[PDB]
Design a protein around this ligand. Structure first.
Ligand SMILES: [Zn+2]
Length: 273
DNA sequence: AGGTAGACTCGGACG
DNA sequence: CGTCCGAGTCTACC
């Protein structure tokens, strides 16, 4: 999940948990709990707190409780559902928050890659992992100037640059590849090789792509669905991601896939330069 | 120095 | 039996 997927999960999850009070926290894979590292302390401190809100920062969910914030990263396969305490759990359920009304928030993650951090609210933004994040791409804090400031200082590939959450928060392999296609820039280009015009164009397409994907409920390409189990529809608007061997939608040249920044990377060798 | 490739956390779907 | 994976950290290598 990237920004659009996490944001869709946020909007669809909030009404199902807001105002509910935690009475138990059960943990079946402790490695997921990163702070406090002692999973018993993590569980104990949340008991008796009420969910007051749910925000997103980059690819993170931030649950706002009474004293604390719970910062959750889904990584590749993490997802949440709300269901009755009376029913058997689904496979791969690793953390469960039980509410006083007999409902439960369940965290499932087949690959076990996801993470959870709990801090007092006032500390959440000045500790890892949130402290080092770059600006929200749908905010005025993300501008061409912000992009250029980092790009001019490094010969790393532009793909490596955009995947770096300290540069700007929210883009991953799908939306990086798509943004670069739409801006007409090859993903292996050294960041410092980009012109001012290219940087402006890239910023414009990054904002448009990520905004469009939010409106369409994210991209369902393998396993992502919203909190109600509904697929997104942005996957029907992809130009390059997952389309290797198929004709480019704009020029008909077969889409290529190769390694860039050590990752599978999709591009049109004609539209991108 | 300042970069990339890819092993690793993990498990399952697909030739 | 090998390869792939909406993330991210880290090592090995150049
Ligand atoms: Zn093309």
């Amino acid at each position: 999940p990237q920004l659009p997927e996490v944001e869709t999960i946020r909007r669809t999850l909030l009404p199902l948990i807001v105002g509910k009070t935690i009475e138990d926290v059960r943990i079946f894979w402790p490695n997921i709990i990163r702070h406090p590292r002692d999973s018993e302390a993590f569980a104990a401190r949340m008991i008796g707190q009420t969910v007051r809100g749910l925000e997103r920062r980059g690819k993170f969910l931030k649950f706002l409780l009474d004293r604390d914030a719970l910062i959750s990263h889904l990584r590749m396969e993490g997802r949440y559902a709300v269901a009755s305490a009376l029913e058997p759990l689904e496979p791969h359920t690793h953390v469960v928050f039980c509410f006083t009304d007999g409902s439960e928030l369940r965290y499932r993650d087949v690959r076990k890659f996801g993470t959870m951090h709990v801090y007092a609210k006032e500390e959440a933004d000045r500790r890892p992992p949130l402290a080092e994040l770059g600006p929200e791409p749908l905010s005025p804090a993300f501008s061409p100037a912000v992009l250029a400031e980092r790009a001019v200082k490094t010969k790393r590939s532009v793909k490596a640059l955009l995947l770096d959450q300290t540069v700007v928060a929210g883009f991953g392999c799908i939306y990086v590849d798509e943004s670069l296609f739409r801006a007409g820039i090859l993903p292996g280009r050294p960041a410092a090789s980009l012109s001012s015009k290219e940087i402006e164009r890239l910023h414009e397409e990054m904002v448009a792509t990520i905004g469009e994907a939010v409106m369409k409920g994210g991209s369902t390409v393998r396993t992502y669905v919203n909190t109600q189990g509904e697929a997104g529809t942005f996957q029907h608007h992809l130009y390059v991601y997952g389309r290797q061997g198929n004709p480019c939608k704009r020029c008909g040249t077969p889409i290529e896939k190769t390694v860039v920044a050590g990752r599978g990377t999709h591009y049109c060798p004609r539209c991108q330069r």
